[PDB]
C-alpha cells in the first residue's frame, strides 16, 4: 500500500526531496543529502545511545 | 442603633438614601461644626447622626428647607 | 479633568506631528560615566523634558533671569517638569512599511477587502514577485502578479503602459486609486443580481467596509507607517542600583535596534545599491516592526542572551499581565493590614480582636491632628517624637479616636460577598486576632493555619456604608436561599443538646416547681438532674392579637435543661419546639421562628446567649472520647468466615470453568458488601440501643452511653460512615484506574492495617487530592466569566407595567415532592390575577407579595400551577423593573432599585460549585390516573398499550395535585386504564424492555407482498421451530436489487384492500426496516395491538450547558406538520421526502438511516416530533418552540446537577443570565435597515415602537431570535473596553478603531477604571443626576 | 512556505557566480576608460 503510495521511483530522488522537506528552497547538490542523512544517525558526533 | 441598623431604615426605606442623608449631616458636624439635636453619651459623630435620623429630624428634605432658608437670609444680607 | 465620554480613531501621520515634540535621530543615550541624556538620543530633554528646576545642562541659563530661555549651546529647556511621564517624540520614515495588526489577525481587514489572497500579497512584500498596481492597457489587470522574470517579458515586450512595481509604494497607490461608491452600489446591485450564501455575505461584508469607511472618514492608506512615535523614557526606563549597576526596559533595544538599520538604509540610499540589498534591509525594517508589535506572531521570535524572547508592546496588555487584570482592577493599598487569627469566645457580633500597633500606625494623622489639637505636640515632629516617647495619653487618644470608627476584615479566597464583613474594633494585648468563631461556617474558614487582612472605611460615606450595609446586623442570610447562614457550628449545638435530654437515669424524678429559677437553685444545688423529665409551670406569650402579645401559664413535664432554658427566651411562642432532644435543623427552623415571628434582634440577643450557655453547660459537660468508646462488635468474625467458604465456592467453580470473571466480579463484590452492611448492622444495633441501666425498675434502655452516636445525631461532625471506618470494615477501594478491587478490608484502625491494606489505601486518597488540588482553577475561570457576562444588569424601574411572564409548577417528578410550588412562588409576583379551585377567588391584582400567608393561604388549596411576571417578560431597556424581581431575601422585602444583581446570581452559583463535582411500572400507593395527549388502544389483552408516545404515566392523588409520574414507552403494556383507581403496591405496566414494538393497531390479513428473498429482505425461516416471514435485513447486507426498494409486507383483507389507518384513509403497511422481523406467514392475520415485528436492543456537563455547547447526534425533529416520506438513497446520508398538509413539500435533508428512526416511510408527524434518537441541541428548540419550553428544558437540567449533590439555590438567579444570552435577534424582512443581520433585539423592539408605529403600517422588518455561546455573546458588545478586557483583544481592538468608534461608560466596569462612581446603587442617585444633565444638556 | 528570508536572500544570491583574472582586469579598464573620458 505505502510502496504504491510511495512515487520515489528511485533512491536519487528520496535523497533529493528529503534534502527539500527538511531545507525548504532549491539549492540541490548531492554531498549536502549525503552527508546531512549520514550525519544524523550515522555520524558519532550528532548521535549517541548511551 | 450602634450595632443595628434597623428603625432609620424603617423611617426612610433605603440603606443607600440612608448613609447618602448620615455622612451629609454628619459632614456638617465633621469639618462645619453645627449643633446636635440629640444628646451626646460619648460617641463619635456617626452615632448621633443615626440617632438624628431615628426621631425624625433630619431628611434630605429637612437638610434641604435649613440650607435654603439660610442661604436666602445669606442672600438678603449681601444687599 | 472630567470628561462626558471616549472615542478611538485613526491616527493621521500629521494627527502624530500634532501630537510630537521633537524627531529622534540616534540610537546613543547617555555618556559612560556622566550618566547623562544625551541629545536626539533616547532620552534627550530637549524634546522630552527636563530633569531640576530651571537648570540648562551647562547651566548657561538660571534662576528665572532666563526664564524661557532655551539654553542655545546645548538646546535644553529651563521651564518645569514632570513631562517625561507625558511627551512622546516621533521618527520620520524613509519609505512606508505597514502595520501588521490590520494584516496578520483573522479576517484580515486589509486584503479581505481587496478581494486578494493572503500569500499573493506576502510575494508582493517580501519582495518577490511583481503585481499590478494598474494595466495602463487593460491587456493586463489589476490584482495580476508578475514573477520578476515574467515581469521581464510583459516589460521588454511594451515597458512603458503598464504599472507593477513590488511593495507598499504600490499597494497605497492601489488604495489611492480605489474609489469607494461605485465599489459599493456595484456590490449592492449584483447581490440582487446572484446573492447566494458565500457571495451575500461577501458583497455584504465589503459594502459593510466601504461604507464604513464613507461615513467614519477614516482612511485605506492608514494602514501604513511613514511616521512613528517613541515613548516618554519614564514607561521605558534605566536605572542604577546601590552597586552602581544598572537595570533596562526591553524596549529600549528595539528602538536602538530599528535606528541603526533606517541609518543603514538612509545611509545606504546615499550610495546607490542594487534593489536586492535594499530588499534584504526593508526586510529587516518590517521585521524589526512585528517585533515591535509582536515578537513571537509571524515567525520566531528574538532573544538577547537571555535565551527568552524579549517582551511585546502588546504583552504589557495581555493575559493578566496588562494593565486590566494585574495593575488597574486589582491594586495594592494603603491603610490595610493583616495577621494570623484566633477566636474570641466572649466576644459579641460587632467586636473583633485587634493588636493595636495595627490600629496604632494605621491610625496616625487622626492622632496628629489631634495632638496640634491639644498642641502637646503643637506640630508635627514633636507628635512623632512623643510617639517615639510611648505615653499613656497616646493610647487614651488611640481609644479616643478609635470608638465607633468601622473597619473591613477580608479573607480569600473571596467566593461571595460573605467572605469579607465589617466590624467594630477592640483592643487587645497580643498579636493573634479573637473573633467571633460561627463565620467561619461563613468564611469557610478553621483555625488551623489561617490568616487575614484588614481594610479602613476611612471616609465617612465609607463609614457609614460599612455601619449600614456590610454591618453583619443588616446581613443574616444568604440571597441565594432563606438560610439562616449562622447555623450553631460544632460544640454550642452539642452541650446544648446534651443538655436538653431525656434520660430516666439520674435522679430527682417526678417532682414540681414554680419557674426555672428555682430549677437552677435546685439543680445547682446537686438535688436533681438536668436532664430529667419532671414538672414546672410556664408561662408563654402569643401575639395573637393585633401584633400584640396575649398571656397565659400552665405545666409541663419537661427536662430541667429545657426549662432552664426557657428563661433565655423573649416570651412569644409555644414549648412545643423546646419540647424535644432539639437536633440542629430544629435549632435552625427555631431561630428561623424567631425572626418569622418576631425579627431581627430578639433572634441576635438569643442567639448571642445560645452560644453562651453552650460553652458554659458543655465545658460543664465534661466530655472526651477514647480507645473504648471505640468498640467492636462480635458478630463479625463468623459473617467473614461463612462468605469466606462462599468466594471459595465460586473460586472452585471458576476452577470447574463454569462461571465467568465478569459474573463471578460482579456477584462477589455483591455478596462483600452485603456483608459491610451486615456488620454495620450488627455494631449499630450493638450500639445504638445496647446499654442496661436500671432506675426504679428492672432495666431500662434509652439514649446511647458509647459518646459516638449524638455526635452525628447533633450535626457537629461525622456520620455512620466514618464511625463503621473507624469500628467496621470501611467500605471498599480503588487504584486511580477506576476500576473496583476485589478482597475488601477486613481490620479498622482500632484493630490496625496490613501493609497491603494500607498500600492500597494510597490509592484513590491520593486521586481524590488531586482533584480537590485542582477544581478551583475550572471554578474561578467559570465564575469569572460568569460575572465576565453580565455586568449590564441593574434594576432601573418601580414597574416596567409589562405583560406576562413565566408560568410555576412544582418539580416532583419521579417521586415525591423535589420543590414544592408553595416554595417555588414564595416573594415572587404573580402574572395575572389569580382565583382559587373555590372559582373566581382571585387575590392578586396581577401582582401582590408573595408572601407566606399568601403560600399558606394556598397550601390548602389544591391549585397546583401559576404564573409570575418574569425578569425576560419583563421590558425595561437596560435594566428591570424591581417587581418582575420581587425580593431580596437577605433583605426579607422587596428588592429597592438599584442594587446589581448579574453579580449576585454568579456569586450564588460559582461559590458551592468549588464543593459540587464530588420491564414494569409499580404503582406505590393509591391514587388518581391522568394520562393524556394520547392516542392508546384497548390492546389484546383488553388492557392498554400506547400508539401515541407523548403520553406518560402519573398517579395523582384522589385531590388532584399529582404524587407519582414515570416515562411509559410506545405500545408498551398495561394492566390499567386512565381515569380508573388502583390498589399500591402494584406493577401496573410490562413491556419487553428490549423491544420497540411494531405493533399494529389494525386488524387485518398477512401476504407477502412488496418484499422477495434476496432482494429487499433475506428468507431466514427458524431452524428450531419452521415458522418465520419475509426476514428484513439491516441497510447494508441485502441485495442491490432491491436495497433501493422499500420492504413491506402489507395489511389486506380477504380481498386485498389497503386496511386504512383507523379513522383516516390512510392505508396501512410497514415499510419494514432491519430488525422488524416478523414471525408469522402469508395468509396469516394480525390482532389490534399486535407486533408483525419486534425491534430488540457533574462540573462539565455544566459547564456545556451553560456555555451555549451543542451536541452531535440529535434525536431529530418535524420541521412542519404533514405527512413525509424517505428520500434519496443514500449517497452518504439517505434524504427525506417532507410533505406538509397545507404546506410545501419539498424540504428534505441528509440522515444518517445508520441510526434509528421514530417515523416511518408513510407515517406522519406533527411538527416539533423527533424523529431520530439521541441528545438534541437547545438550539433546534428556539428555533422551532417558544422560549417557556426551552428555559424550562434547561433550567430543570442543571437545577437536577445541583440538586443531586443535595444543593440549593432560588430558580430566579438562573433566570437572569437568560435574558443576557439574548441581546440580539437576526432580521427576517427587510426596508429598515440590512437585511437579516443579528441586531439588538432591544432596539428592534424601539425603532419598530416608532416604525412600525404610524410612522409607518410597515417599512421595517420582522425578525428571528438568536443565541450565542457565552465568551463571543460577551464579545458582541456595545462597549468594546469590557470586551478589550480579557480576551481577544488585540481583534477587538482594531476592529473598534476602522469604524473611529467610541463608548458611554454605562456598565460598571467601564467607569470603574476610571475613578468615577457607580452608575447603581449609591451612585445610582448620582449618576441619574449627571443622566439629566446629560438630558438637560 | 518559507518565510525565513535568510534563506530568501542565501538563495538569491547563490544565483549569481563568480569569474577570475580577466574579466575582472577588464572591468577595471572598462571603469578607468570611462572614467578617463569624462
Ligand atoms: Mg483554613
Ligand atoms: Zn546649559
Ligand atoms: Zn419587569
Known sequence: ?50 | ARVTVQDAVEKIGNRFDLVLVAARRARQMQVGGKDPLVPEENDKTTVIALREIEEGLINNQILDVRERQEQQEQEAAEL | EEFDAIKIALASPDMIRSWSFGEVKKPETINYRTFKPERDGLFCARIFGPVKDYECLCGKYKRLKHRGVICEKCGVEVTQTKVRRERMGHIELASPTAHIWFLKSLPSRIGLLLDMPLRDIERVLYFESYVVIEGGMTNLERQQILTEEQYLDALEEFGDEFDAKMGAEAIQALLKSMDLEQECEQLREELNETNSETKRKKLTKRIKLLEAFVQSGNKPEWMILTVLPVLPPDLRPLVPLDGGRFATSDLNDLYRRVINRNNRLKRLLDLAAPDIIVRNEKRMLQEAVDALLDNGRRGRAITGSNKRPLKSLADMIKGKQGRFRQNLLGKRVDYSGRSVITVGPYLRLHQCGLPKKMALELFKPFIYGKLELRGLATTIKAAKKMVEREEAVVWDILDEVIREHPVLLNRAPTLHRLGIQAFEPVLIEGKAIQLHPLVCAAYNADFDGDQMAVHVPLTLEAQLEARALMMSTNNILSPANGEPIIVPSQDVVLGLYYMTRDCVNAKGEGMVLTGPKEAERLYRSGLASLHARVKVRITEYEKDANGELVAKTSLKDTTVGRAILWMIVPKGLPYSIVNQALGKKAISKMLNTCYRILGLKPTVIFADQIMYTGFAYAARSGASVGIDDMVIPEKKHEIISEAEAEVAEIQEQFQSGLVTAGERYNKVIDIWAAANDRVSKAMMDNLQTETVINRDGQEEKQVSFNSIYMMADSGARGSAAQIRQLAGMRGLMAKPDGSIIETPITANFREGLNVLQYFISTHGARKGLADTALKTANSGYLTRRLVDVAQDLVVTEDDCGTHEGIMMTPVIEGGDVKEPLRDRVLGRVTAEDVLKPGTADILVPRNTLLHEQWCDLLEENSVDAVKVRSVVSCDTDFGVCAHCYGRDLARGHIINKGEAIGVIAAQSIGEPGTQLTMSSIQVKNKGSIKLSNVKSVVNSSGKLVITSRNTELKLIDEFGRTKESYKVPYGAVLAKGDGEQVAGGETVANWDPHTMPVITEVSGFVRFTDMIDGQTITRQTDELTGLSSLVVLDSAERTAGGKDLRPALKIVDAQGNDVLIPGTDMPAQYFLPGKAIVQLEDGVQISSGDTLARIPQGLPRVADLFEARRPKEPAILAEISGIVSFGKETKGKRRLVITPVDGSDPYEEMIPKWRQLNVFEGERVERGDVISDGPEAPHDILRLRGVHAVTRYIVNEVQDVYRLQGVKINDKHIEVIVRQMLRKATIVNAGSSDFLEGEQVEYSRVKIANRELEANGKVGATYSRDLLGITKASLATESFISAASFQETTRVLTEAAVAGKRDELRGLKENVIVGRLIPAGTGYAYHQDRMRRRAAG | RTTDPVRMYMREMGTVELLTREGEIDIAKRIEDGINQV
Not at chain 1, 5 to 32: C, H, K, W
Open chain 1, 1 to 50: 500500500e505505502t510502496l504504491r503510495v510511495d512515487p520515489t521511483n528511485d533512491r536519487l530522488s528520496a535523497l533529493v526531496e528529503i534534502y527539500r522537506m527538511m531545507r525548504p528552497g532549491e539549492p540541490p547538490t548531492r554531498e549536502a543529502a549525503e552527508s546531512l542523512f549520514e550525519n544524523l544517525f550515522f555520524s558519532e558526533d550528532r548521535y549517541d545511545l548511551s
